[PDB]
Design a protein around this ligand. Sequence first.
Ligand SMILES: Nc1ncnc2c1ncn2[C@@H]1O[C@H](COP(=O)(O)OP(=O)(O)O)[C@@H](O)[C@H]1O
Ligand SMILES: Nc1ncnc2c1ncn2[C@@H]1O[C@H](COP(=O)(O)OP(=O)(O)O)[C@@H](O)[C@H]1O
Lengths: 49, 43, 153, 92
Amino acid sequence: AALDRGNEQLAREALGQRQSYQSHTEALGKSLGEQRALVEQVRGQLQKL
Amino acid sequence: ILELEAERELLNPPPSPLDKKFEQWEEQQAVEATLAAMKARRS
Amino acid sequence: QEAPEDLLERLLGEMELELIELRRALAQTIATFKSTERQRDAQQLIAQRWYEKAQAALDRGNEQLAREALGQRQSYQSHTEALGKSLGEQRALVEQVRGQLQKLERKYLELKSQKNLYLARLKSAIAAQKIEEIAGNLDNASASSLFERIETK
Amino acid sequence: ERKYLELKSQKNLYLARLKSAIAAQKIEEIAGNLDNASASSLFERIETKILELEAERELLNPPPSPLDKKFEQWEEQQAVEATLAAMKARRS
Ligand SMILES: Nc1ncnc2c1ncn2[C@@H]1O[C@H](COP(=O)(O)OP(=O)(O)O)[C@@H](O)[C@H]1O
Ligand SMILES: Nc1ncnc2c1ncn2[C@@H]1O[C@H](COP(=O)(O)OP(=O)(O)O)[C@@H](O)[C@H]1O
């Protein structure tokens, strides 16, 4: 709804603004894929001992 | 100060200009795809 | 001459100290390179001021002052050109040196990727050879074997 | 004074090129080319050191003759066959 008045310029700034946050979200998303599987393996060790 | 600036740079080289040139190339469609789709999302 | 296996570890550790020192020395050189570049720009700024200063210097009609200002800058113009060329040779040279360092670092770790392996094969043989002196073959019945030297005792 | 600093603007550079070569030349004595197979390379000087002990320990306790190994397999031939042959006759 930013440019509903016809000010298409504001749209690029908002979209350019989010790409900074989009990169961060993807960075954490992948980082939480590796750690999720690793600890579960560790939990097996404790239950074994 | 300048010594430490380059010394830290060698220990972890920065990305090549091609990487930055392509990184902007990839970002070009990211905004355009959203911006182009934005016109097609409300029309 | 000492034990060759000890030589490798001592020699390899010495090189690693040398390599990092090369990293430091290059860092200082690339800094002065930067400092000289900045110093070059400052000089032309003053000469730029004199030339701009000379533009309005004679607006009253005193053309004489113009020559002094222009004659003044030529001293700075010569210096700027002297540094400009001097920074053309050095700029390309160090970049070649940087290639050497990147080459050694990549190859250096390859040697260390193997040194631990050779130290293992060596000690397996040494310990194994140590066996033949204490027991060897039970039927040896020779002096070398420790048991036989005890059996006769 | 003007000229003095010019020399110091370069001295740090030459000290860098010098140490790159010296360290690089130090490489050819430890590893060089893996196929060198020469005394100079440290690895080869270590590679033979192991091989020496291999044969030296062999002479001090000679290995079994090929006939012994040939017969040792001959004896093992019936050990499995006698059990394997008997296995068919143990369940039939
Ligand atoms: N099957 C065997 N293998 C090795 N040595 C044997 C065997 N049977 C008897 N011997 C005797 O054991 C000795 C082993 O020699 P060794 O102890 O190596 O000599 P040294 O005392 O110089 O070390 C030989 O002199 C040999 O006569
Ligand atoms: N591709 C190769 N490059 C260099 N040396 C090789 C190569 N292939 C085999 N060699 C052998 O490695 C040796 C390297 O010589 P080098 O170790 O420099 O002699 P030195 O022991 O006097 O230093 C040569 O004698 C050569 O026979």
